[PDB]
Amino acid sequence: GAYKYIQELWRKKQSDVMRFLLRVRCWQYRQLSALHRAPRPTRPDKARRLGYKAKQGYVIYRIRVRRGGRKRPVPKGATYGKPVHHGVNQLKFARSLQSVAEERAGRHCGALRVLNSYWVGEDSTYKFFEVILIDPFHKAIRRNPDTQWITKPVHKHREMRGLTSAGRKSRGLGKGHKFHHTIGGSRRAAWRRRNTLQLHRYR
Amino acid sequence: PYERRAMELLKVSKDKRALKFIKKRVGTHIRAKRKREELSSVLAAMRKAAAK
Amino acid sequence: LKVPPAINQFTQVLDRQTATQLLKLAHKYRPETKQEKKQRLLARAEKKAAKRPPVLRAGVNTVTTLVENKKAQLVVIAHDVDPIELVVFL
Amino acid sequence: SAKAKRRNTTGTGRMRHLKIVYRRFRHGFREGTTPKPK
Amino acid sequence: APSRNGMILKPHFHKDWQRRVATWFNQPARKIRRRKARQARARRIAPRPAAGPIRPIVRCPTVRYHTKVRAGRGFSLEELRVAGIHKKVARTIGISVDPRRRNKSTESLQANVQRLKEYRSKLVLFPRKPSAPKKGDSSAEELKLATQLTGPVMPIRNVFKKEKARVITEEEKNFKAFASLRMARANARLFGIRAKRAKEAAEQDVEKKK
RNA sequence: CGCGACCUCAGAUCAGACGUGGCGACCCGCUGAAUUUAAGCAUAUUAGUCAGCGGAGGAAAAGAAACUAACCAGGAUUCCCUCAGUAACGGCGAGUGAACAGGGAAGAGCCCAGCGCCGAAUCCCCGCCCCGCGGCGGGGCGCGGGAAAUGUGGCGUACGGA
RNA sequence: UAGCGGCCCCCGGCGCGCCGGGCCCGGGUCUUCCCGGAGUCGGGUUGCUUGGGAAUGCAGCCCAAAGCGGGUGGUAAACUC
Ligand SMILES: [Mg+2]
Ligand SMILES: [Mg+2]
Ligand SMILES: [Mg+2]
Ligand SMILES: [Mg+2]
Ligand SMILES: [Mg+2]
Ligand SMILES: [Mg+2]
Ligand SMILES: [Mg+2]
Ligand SMILES: [Mg+2]
Ligand SMILES: [Mg+2]
Ligand SMILES: [Mg+2]
Ligand SMILES: [Mg+2]
Ligand SMILES: [Mg+2]
Ligand SMILES: [Mg+2]
Ligand SMILES: [Mg+2]
Ligand SMILES: [Mg+2]
Ligand SMILES: [Mg+2]
Ligand SMILES: [Mg+2]
Ligand SMILES: [Mg+2]
Ligand SMILES: [Mg+2]
Ligand SMILES: [Mg+2]
Ligand SMILES: [Mg+2]
Ligand SMILES: [Mg+2]
């Protein structure tokens, strides 16, 4: 099946041919606007692996992200305080740029509902992404029981709570000795549980 | 391109610096080793085609 | 730009006169329209009351599987698909 | 300013719709019917 | 400011602890809400066993505890395969399952098999449709006697075998424990070097001799 | 040139739909201080805390192993007791500080893509007719209209399977 | 107020008898075939954070893989089971 061929091809990203195609895309998108709807998927494989289904009610939004770190938002240097917290320029934001992209699209298209994302290309200044969105009221989705879990009102704005593939990684959850701080629901609830006194009746 | 260049080193018989070069880019010894043996075998295929 | 040969190859295209003959052939072995489908199944219902011929085969995944199966003698392709990665290897 | 919060909240005003929603919930949001006349 | 004598100690009352205190005046009511939900469940699923499905015998890990026995997750796939039960049906009559478990020891696998056999014997199975009893079903007396089993079904009791008063041979008198111990620890420790010095001495002897 | 397929992109008070704010005790994701302690202070501590911003539910989040172990082995998650003020971190000063095994509450497991078989066997909407209609559905009929080979449905998913 | 005390309305709850549709699936045996998710793992490097100390986790830049393969086995490394 061709898709398996497609897969190892897109893994051959260093090859001269793939390099050429991505190079042309990156030029093309740089000249287009920073956020717009693609009519069909750029990567059919990535979409099928992730969940995309050639049916009504699926949309794909291309978005351009500016690259680099996070300098502290402050007037001059003048971070008033101690020389420990003087640090400011070479600081790095905890979440990726990929989740940032997802966040911006989801907030713009509020009615829609964010499934997942994949990479397409990059310059120095910019990365590029393809965000898969869904309409939760078209009957194609409502009646199909595999998908009607998204229609439920809990999953509003998933990207904002970090339940997307990117959001799960920032939470630091995992099994084993490498992921002890999250035991419990999250990093926050761990701290709560360890730093509470249980004053009993009987003591 | 790096694989091509490491091949040209295997042609000029500098197997240690070629290994060094791969280890420098890719990192570990095992991955570099298995990649090197593959590149030697394809050069063997060139030896076969020149033979027959 | 300096275009690599594996893409340049699509510029070599089939001539007008031979292509018309190809379409002349497929016109004989066209797949059935929807309305004829209801009427053939209706006649088949009559068959129920009382072998498919060869046809074209569509879809890349179909084509390639039955290429591995070495059944197809002739493979036609379109030159102007928007992401080329689909067909390149074929 | 928690005191500023309490100066301006839901309990304060009418809540002319919201107080009666509590009442409708009390009877499971019954609708369109009536009882039988005498 | 320490006067003459005490335990030097580091108490952790620097964080804002008086905020996050969990008081336990709930307790008695919580006990009741559990008790009520348990009685209502047993009232719902009336004749099925209250505790749930039977769970298998398992050896404990860690040198400390490996004498004990517990309940596990569920019966293994080999125990089922060998007793001759489709796993999904086994699922349906209230038998605990977990597939992930391996089975290295023969005594465990085999004893778990025995345990299922007694269960499979005792089980009083009802028809799907009452009108037509089937082959794999229970008799009318059995349906009459069916009733809830209170408590954990087939309780795990750790038995100990009694050894009668033996006569001691003088050989048994002779055997030397302590020496055998310190000796065996030493051979295990030094095992690798005996081979290293042996390879070096044989390799040097062969090059020097030949 | 003119006409016709597609592709890409606009405008419509187009026909039908949805978002937009509030509350914010409890929850989730970010950003993120100093008073103060050390008899001083600058690393540490205070603290991933107050304050700022966004998003939710009657609960949320979590979750069915890229696991623990290294014993004759255990077997999703969540919560309680104990392991423990321990192993470890630290101007080795001040102080900080877990987990696994064990006994308990509750106890339920599953699904795609792919790889492959099947005349696309799939779907949505209009129109017409019958029933029912205060959680807008069941059925029958249209050379009625589109979606879909850049892959729709059935079987089936690592416990192997056809 | 007590009482397995009474009466009257609405809503639900388990049962029974019948209509109009859909679903036509299994248990074993032997023979032949089939089987996996990349800018992701991993490495160097910087800064924060964590009890994690030749770097526990997270992120940014740069490099950039494999298929009897890969990760883990709490002191870096090579060989090895
Ligand atoms: Mg942070
Ligand atoms: Mg004293
Ligand atoms: Mg209970
Ligand atoms: Mg309108
Ligand atoms: Mg609100
Ligand atoms: Mg001080
Ligand atoms: Mg002072
Ligand atoms: Mg001072
Ligand atoms: Mg800190
Ligand atoms: Mg701390
Ligand atoms: Mg609500
Ligand atoms: Mg949830
Ligand atoms: Mg989760
Ligand atoms: Mg999981
Ligand atoms: Mg453990
Ligand atoms: Mg499934
Ligand atoms: Mg399915
Ligand atoms: Mg599929
Ligand atoms: Mg009374
Ligand atoms: Mg720190
Ligand atoms: Mg990362
Ligand atoms: Mg260690």
Side-chain angles (χ1 to χ4, degrees):
Chain A
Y3 293 134
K4 194 173 205 252
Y5 288 100
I6 290 156
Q7 181 171 292
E8 267 268 358
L9 190 63
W10 269 100
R11 297 173 168 181
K12 294 282 185 198
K13 298 197 184 72
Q14 300 273 325
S15 69
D16 293 333
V17 174
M18 290 301 303
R19 208 198 314 163
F20 170 89
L21 284 154
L22 76 94
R23 186 164 60 182
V24 170
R25 261 65 160 284
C26 92
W27 174 88
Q28 186 171 9
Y29 304 151
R30 196 159 61 262
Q31 269 307 73
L32 288 153
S33 83
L35 176 145
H36 72 297
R37 178 172 162 189
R40 61 188 82 265
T42 306
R43 292 194 183 183
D45 183 32
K46 283 302 281 183
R48 294 176 56 66
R49 275 170 283 172
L50 298 166
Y52 177 75
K53 280 313 313 291
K55 207 163 272 176
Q56 293 163 306
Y58 278 57
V59 199
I60 310 189
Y61 271 71
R62 193 182 296 99
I63 52 194
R64 183 213 317 178
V65 164
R66 201 170 176 95
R67 213 146 176 284
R70 171 176 170 281
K71 73 199 313 303
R72 195 189 291 284
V74 283
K76 302 165 30 182
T79 322
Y80 310 98
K82 312 195 171 187
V84 174
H85 309 93
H86 278 146
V88 41
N89 260 351
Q90 295 175 322
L91 307 191
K92 288 90 187 182
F93 183 50
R95 325 209 321 271
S96 67
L97 303 179
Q98 187 172 347
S99 60
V100 170
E102 288 176 328
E103 187 254 316
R104 287 179 184 170
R107 182 172 304 289
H108 180 259
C109 299
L112 302 186
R113 208 145 292 190
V114 182
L115 182 78
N116 220 317
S117 70
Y118 58 102
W119 180 100
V120 292
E122 60 196 51
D123 210 54
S124 54
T125 54
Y126 301 120
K127 274 189 191 288
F128 293 95
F129 295 102
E130 292 279 10
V131 181
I132 297 156
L133 290 138
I134 286 163
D135 189 309
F137 289 75
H138 196 259
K139 298 286 190 171
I141 292 94
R142 284 173 97 72
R143 290 156 191 175
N144 177 260
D146 186 354
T147 56
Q148 79 180 1
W149 60 264
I150 303 153
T151 55
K152 295 195 175 180
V154 169
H155 303 254
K156 286 183 183 190
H157 293 284
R158 283 146 49 81
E159 75 296 349
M160 313 305 317
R161 289 106 49 84
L163 317 183
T164 49
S165 189
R168 282 192 74 78
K169 292 160 186 175
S170 182
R171 296 167 63 179
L173 59 90
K175 293 205 191 65
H177 70 268
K178 320 214 152 184
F179 310 112
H180 288 158
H181 50 62
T182 53
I183 199 176
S186 64
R187 204 198 307 280
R188 193 63 48 79
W191 180 92
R192 208 202 333 288
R193 178 169 36 76
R194 286 152 183 189
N195 302 49
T196 42
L197 270 184
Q198 273 60 27
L199 283 179
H200 298 184
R201 273 165 68 246
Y202 285 105
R203 314 273 180 73
Chain B
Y2 82 102
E3 296 182 321
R4 292 165 205 165
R5 200 169 273 89
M7 291 258 278
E8 290 166 40
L9 265 194
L10 292 157
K11 286 176 189 169
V12 184
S13 80
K14 292 182 179 178
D15 69 318
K16 189 184 172 178
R17 275 161 215 66
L19 177 52
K20 284 195 149 217
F21 183 71
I22 291 159
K23 190 176 175 296
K24 189 177 287 299
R25 303 206 74 71
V26 82
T28 57
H29 202 276
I30 291 80
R31 298 186 185 192
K33 205 198 294 181
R34 193 179 300 282
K35 189 53 65 77
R36 192 183 59 174
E37 293 299 304
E38 276 271 280
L39 295 162
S40 294
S41 294
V42 298
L43 192 59
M46 291 161 61
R47 194 186 306 282
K48 194 182 292 305
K52 191 167 301 177
Chain C
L1 276 52
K2 220 162 175 295
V3 184
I7 298 166
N8 175 230
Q9 74 188 318
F10 293 96
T11 62
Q12 186 185 128
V13 314
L14 190 62
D15 64 40
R16 198 76 66 77
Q17 206 277 309
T18 315
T20 181
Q21 293 176 237
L22 214 174
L23 300 164
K24 195 89 80 176
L25 269 66
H27 196 95
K28 280 184 174 47
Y29 299 89
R30 297 168 79 183
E32 194 191 340
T33 48
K34 324 268 182 171
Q35 305 303 331
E36 280 297 325
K37 284 283 279 187
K38 290 176 182 177
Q39 290 180 16
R40 201 187 83 263
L41 293 77
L42 195 176
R44 188 160 289 285
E46 296 331 317
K47 187 174 180 295
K48 296 322 180 182
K51 291 174 292 298
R52 72 185 293 180
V55 285
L56 291 165
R57 293 278 296 170
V60 296
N61 282 290
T62 51
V63 168
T64 54
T65 180
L66 69 85
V67 163
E68 280 305 329
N69 212 44
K70 203 263 177 158
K71 183 167 159 73
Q73 296 176 216
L74 189 180
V75 174
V76 190
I77 291 177
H79 89 297
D80 56 324
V81 71
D82 213 319
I84 202 77
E85 291 100 333
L86 288 163
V87 194
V88 161
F89 66 121
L90 189 172
Chain D
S1 52
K3 200 165 215 162
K5 286 176 171 181
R6 75 159 85 104
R7 289 197 193 85
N8 187 29
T9 30
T10 45
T12 302
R14 282 149 174 283
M15 300 202 294
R16 74 205 299 181
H17 175 74
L18 189 62
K19 77 207 292 288
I20 70 159
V21 167
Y22 307 151
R23 170 160 51 76
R24 285 216 310 285
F25 163 75
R26 213 182 319 288
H27 289 107
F29 293 99
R30 70 154 175 196
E31 304 192 0
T33 65
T34 48
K36 193 173 74 173
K38 299 166 83 163
Chain E
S3 291
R4 307 195 208 76
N5 199 1
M7 285 200 197
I8 312 312
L9 76 186
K10 272 88 173 183
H12 296 71
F13 300 118
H14 298 260
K15 296 177 189 193
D16 186 31
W17 66 270
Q18 300 204 307
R19 204 188 169 185
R20 303 168 300 277
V21 305
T23 59
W24 284 52
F25 304 120
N26 279 286
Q27 266 208 27
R30 170 151 59 191
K31 282 173 164 269
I32 298 158
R33 203 198 311 100
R34 262 81 174 283
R35 188 170 159 74
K36 281 193 183 298
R38 193 178 297 104
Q39 292 163 349
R41 202 220 178 187
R43 283 192 283 93
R44 190 188 314 103
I45 69 193
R48 295 132 181 159
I54 43 156
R55 287 184 145 71
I57 289 164
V58 158
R59 263 281 183 288
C60 191
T62 78
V63 67
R64 179 162 178 185
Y65 294 96
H66 74 81
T67 65
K68 305 289 178 69
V69 188
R70 325 182 297 159
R73 197 80 165 144
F75 285 79
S76 177
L77 295 160
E78 283 294 319
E79 293 163 21
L80 299 170
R81 193 179 303 177
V82 171
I85 313 282
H86 189 251
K87 66 193 177 74
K88 297 183 184 177
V89 173
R91 176 78 173 173
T92 61
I93 67 171
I95 310 173
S96 303
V97 182
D98 57 339
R100 284 192 301 282
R101 278 185 72 204
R102 77 196 80 264
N103 276 115
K104 286 170 66 174
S105 38
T106 309
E107 48 170 294
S108 65
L109 174 56
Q110 211 69 39
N112 294 134
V113 166
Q114 193 73 38
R115 208 159 177 281
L116 294 167
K117 290 282 182 181
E118 266 162 356
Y119 179 78
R120 177 64 187 186
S121 80
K122 296 176 175 170
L123 202 172
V124 174
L125 181 49
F126 279 60
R128 291 145 60 92
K129 189 174 262 287
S131 171
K134 257 63 182 174
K135 190 182 170 185
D137 284 301
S138 41
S139 309
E141 64 187 85
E142 294 152 20
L143 301 177
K144 293 185 181 175
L145 299 179
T147 185
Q148 286 209 316
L149 179 60
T150 173
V153 52
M154 291 199 299
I156 296 166
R157 285 167 57 263
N158 49 13
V159 72
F160 295 111
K161 68 177 267 292
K162 301 176 186 180
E163 309 95 322
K164 70 193 177 175
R166 188 191 286 280
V167 187
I168 303 178
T169 55
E170 280 260 23
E171 174 271 299
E172 292 168 41
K173 201 68 77 75
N174 189 43
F175 171 68
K176 304 181 208 311
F178 178 72
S180 183
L181 290 162
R182 293 289 292 157
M183 293 272 294
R185 301 180 166 149
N187 297 327
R189 193 170 83 261
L190 304 171
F191 190 71
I193 305 103
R194 263 79 176 283
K196 199 198 176 194
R197 291 170 193 160
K199 189 73 80 71
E200 198 72 39
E203 192 170 31
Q204 65 89 32
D205 292 322
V206 172
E207 280 165 0
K208 302 169 181 179
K209 291 164 183 176
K210 279 76 172 180

